Amino acid sequence: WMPAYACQRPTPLTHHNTGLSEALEILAEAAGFEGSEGRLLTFCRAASVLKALPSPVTTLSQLQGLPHFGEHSSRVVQELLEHGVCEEVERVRRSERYQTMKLFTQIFGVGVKTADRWYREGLRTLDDLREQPQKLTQQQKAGLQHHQDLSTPVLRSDVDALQQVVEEAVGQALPGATVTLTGGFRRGKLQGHDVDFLITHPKEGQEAGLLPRVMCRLQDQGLILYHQHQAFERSFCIFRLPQPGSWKAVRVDLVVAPVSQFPFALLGWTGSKLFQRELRRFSRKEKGLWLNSHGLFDPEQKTFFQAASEEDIFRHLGLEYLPPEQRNA
DNA sequence: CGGCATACG
DNA sequence: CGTA
DNA sequence: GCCG
Ligand SMILES: [Cl-]
Ligand SMILES: [Mg+2]
Ligand SMILES: [Mg+2]
Ligand code: NA
Incomplete structure (x- = not known):
């Protein structure tokens, strides 16, 4: 059953x-x-x-x-x-172990391994970390400074205004390029702790070099509080989002894919995390095919499956199609 | 027992 | 190491 | 920790 x-x-x-x-x-x-x-x-x-x-x-x-x-x-x-x-x-x-590991790993730039090292060194609170800034990367410093704002959920009502700002920069960087909302909001969530966007262009190859051009334009608009390049195809940023009389920091992920790979990138970036791990495990262990966000590989024939839609990918794996709203594993 | 997703910055 |  |  x-x-x-x-x-x-x-x-x-x-x-x-x-x-x-x-x-x-x-x-x-x-x-x-x-x-x-x-x-x-x-x-x-x-x-x-x-x-x-x-x-x-x-x-x-x-x-x-x-x-x-x-x-x-x-x-x-x-x-x-x-x-x-x-x-x-x-x-x-x-x-204490659970509460501190949870608090530290919530910081952008801190994973389990870093959190565990800090825990073993006796550190317990965010203020413990702030008092020892020599032990922090620039990314971690940004994550720590912005931690309070980043702990408050983004509303679906915020995502649309943000998408329009990204679309304006993307259109100047490359006319005809498109922006698609992915991640948890595409699965129907009314809130989230970041916003995820996938960018492509209908003419294969035109997307090459696009993300640096998008990031430079967003930075010039004053919208980027942190990004790692302040060539690449994924950017994990902190953006300024308007609020009544002020603003707040929000995590935004931007990804570029060529249109040939768009269905695979859309599938991967729409999640959930567990859904995608299970889908890749199923692909390899049950069907003998290797799945990632760029394609689906048959290692016996040494061929990639062309897909024009997420529906194509589910069909090629012998799975009944699930819309994003039913991928909340 | 082996295996547990698979990438990019 | 971090990010997804 | 559980599946195959
Ligand atoms: Cl384990
Ligand atoms: Mg998200
Ligand atoms: Mg994200
Ligand atoms: Na983290």
Whole structure:
């Protein structure tokens, strides 16, 4: 009844098992902070299975036969069903290790490895990091300075005005180039912690060299609070977004792809992260084909699949098409 | 047991 | 290392 | 942590 890969089933943004999935995702996140990527994946997959169910889990028996539910994930659900809390989850939540790793990894420019090193050095708060600026990269300094604004969600109502500003710079950089909203907003989210855009041009090859030209124009408009080039095809920036009487910093990702690759880039950048990992795993392990954001490779024939749409890609993988709103794994 | 997505800055 |  |  429930297939094993998240790319084989629709997963809507809102669902019927929110509390159970959130608890499993705490355990997944904590596994990542300890470097246990396998455990992270299992807990994420188990949470995602619950998101895909048609109604609430009320009884432990309803987990029998569901993929990714073994002894540990079933016990978590059992405790939530019987007591409304799971002791392991609550112990993680209150733990100094979890809280500090979460806070540090939320900083733009800081990953698990850096956060863990700082934790082992005794650092615990953002002000601890600010007092030791010699140990920070320029990217991390920007992430730290902007952390408060970047912690507040972007509204879908903000995304449209931002897209128009990006489109104006893109049109001057290369007339005819287009801007497509991707990421979580394309999956239907009403908020997010950044905004993701994919840029292309209908004439193959015209997009070469485009992103530096776009970034220079946005910087000249005064809109870029931070970017790494203040040749490339992805830029992870901090943008100035207007607010009543002021403004706030927002994370924006910009990506350029040639139109031949656009369906693959659109698929990859639309997410969710788990959906794409599961889709690439399915492609390789079940179909023998290698998938990335540039193409789909048959390693036996040594050929790439041309695709003109995301629908083409799902068909070439033998999967029923899922619209972006059903990719919220 | 091996495997766990696969890129670019 | 960081980012997705 | 779980699948195959
Ligand atoms: Cl692990
Ligand atoms: Mg996003
Ligand atoms: Mg993003
Ligand atoms: Na980070």
